[PDB]
Each structure stands twice: as structure tokens, then as C-alpha cells.
Amino acid sequence: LTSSERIDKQIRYILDGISALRKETCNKSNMCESSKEALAENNLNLPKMAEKDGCFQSGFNEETCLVKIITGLLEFEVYLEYLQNRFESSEEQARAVQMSTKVLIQFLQKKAKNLDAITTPDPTTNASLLTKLQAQNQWLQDMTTHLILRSFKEFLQSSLRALRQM
Incomplete structure (x- = not known):
């Protein structure tokens, strides 16, 4: 189970959480x-994948897709704050999707050799986007x-087929 294999397996947990966070x-x-x-x-106004990223069989990518994953998990992180407490009924499931979803942010930073470290665009501005949503x-x-x-x-789903196709 190389680090990359642990990346995909970790997102599989991210979605299992969204089931309890979307049901x-x-x-x-x-x-x-x-x-x-x-x-x-x-x-919403979060960063989403698209046919321009090229993370699909029709123009699959590698460095452009992985980038949107770093640049995509940071903004997703603010929205994780959204579901990291708003679910007072399933508070545990909310912490199960954000916790692992963060494990991908780190395991990706180091496992993204020759890449990663996308920084975080719209950080303080994301503070208002959280005070605005x-x-x-x-x-x-x-x-x-x-x-x-x-x-x-969806977004994470393509992330799994992108790290596996890489």
C-alpha cells in the first residue's frame, strides 16, 4: 500500500462520511x-473540477489535476468548517469527513513530490466566505x-481515479 494507495483509500472514507452528511x-x-x-x-463559490482540469478519460492530466487537489482541499477546508459543527445531530460523522479529508491534505503535500505546496488562495477572504455562507x-x-x-x-471521486490513473 504505497502512500498514493493510502491517499485514494483515505478519500474513500471522506465520501463514506458525506453519506451521513448528505442523508x-x-x-x-x-x-x-x-x-x-x-x-x-x-x-456555491468554492473551487470545483471541470473539463478544463483534464481529470477525466477525455484529456486525463497528472500535475494539473493533483494541483487542483491541493488548491481544492484548502478551500474545501473552509467548507469543512461549515460541516465540522453545523451537524449537531451527526457531529461525529461531520468530524469523520473533515478529519480524514485533512489527512489527504497532508499525505498529499508530502506524497506530491515535485508538486504540492499550492499555499492557500483566498485564506483571510475565506474567513468572510465562512461568515458569508x-x-x-x-x-x-x-x-x-x-x-x-x-x-x-464528485470532486473527491475524480481525485481517486486521478491518483489511480497517474
Whole structure:
């Protein structure tokens, strides 16, 4: 189990957590099988993967994908703060997705030889983005937790097939 194999196996835990962090949310998600609305596409302002990164069979990458993983786990970290306490009912599951999700931030920094150390863009500004996702209206507040869990599921998913295809 080389370090890279431990990276993918560690994200498998990150998603297993999002299941407990997206099952109760989707229920009263006001944006997932909910009522009185169900008309929102959820568009946070976090960094998400895309066809430009090239982390798919159609233009797979290696240094560009891994980069978005470092630069992607830092911003994700602020959103982890979002789910690292807001889940007072499943507080443990919230700490299970952020804890391991952080283990990838470190295991990646050192296991990303010839790369990593992307720093953290929008750090102090992320402090307001955290004071803004929670300061928005109840509507944009119920979508914040949702979309974030939507990136972890997909976003991290591609991260697994990217470190395995590398």
C-alpha cells in the first residue's frame, strides 16, 4: 500500500462520511426531494473540477489535476468548517469527513513530490466566505451544506481515479 494507495483509500472514507452528511441534509435540504421549493441548482463559490482540469478519460492530466487537489482541499477546508459543527445531530460523522479529508491534505503535500505546496488562495477572504455562507438568508444557507457535499462526492471521486490513473 504505497502512500498514493493510502491517499485514494483515505478519500474513500471522506465520501463514506458525506453519506451521513448528505442523508440528513437532503431530507430537510430545502433543495433535495424537499417541498415548497425544489427549484435551486445550488451554486456555491468554492473551487470545483471541470473539463478544463483534464481529470477525466477525455484529456486525463497528472500535475494539473493533483494541483487542483491541493488548491481544492484548502478551500474545501473552509467548507469543512461549515460541516465540522453545523451537524449537531451527526457531529461525529461531520468530524469523520473533515478529519480524514485533512489527512489527504497532508499525505498529499508530502506524497506530491515535485508538486504540492499550492499555499492557500483566498485564506483571510475565506474567513468572510465562512461568515458569508452562514450570514446569507436561510435559503442560501440550506444550499451551502448541500452543494458542498455535492463537490466532496464528485470532486473527491475524480481525485481517486486521478491518483489511480497517474
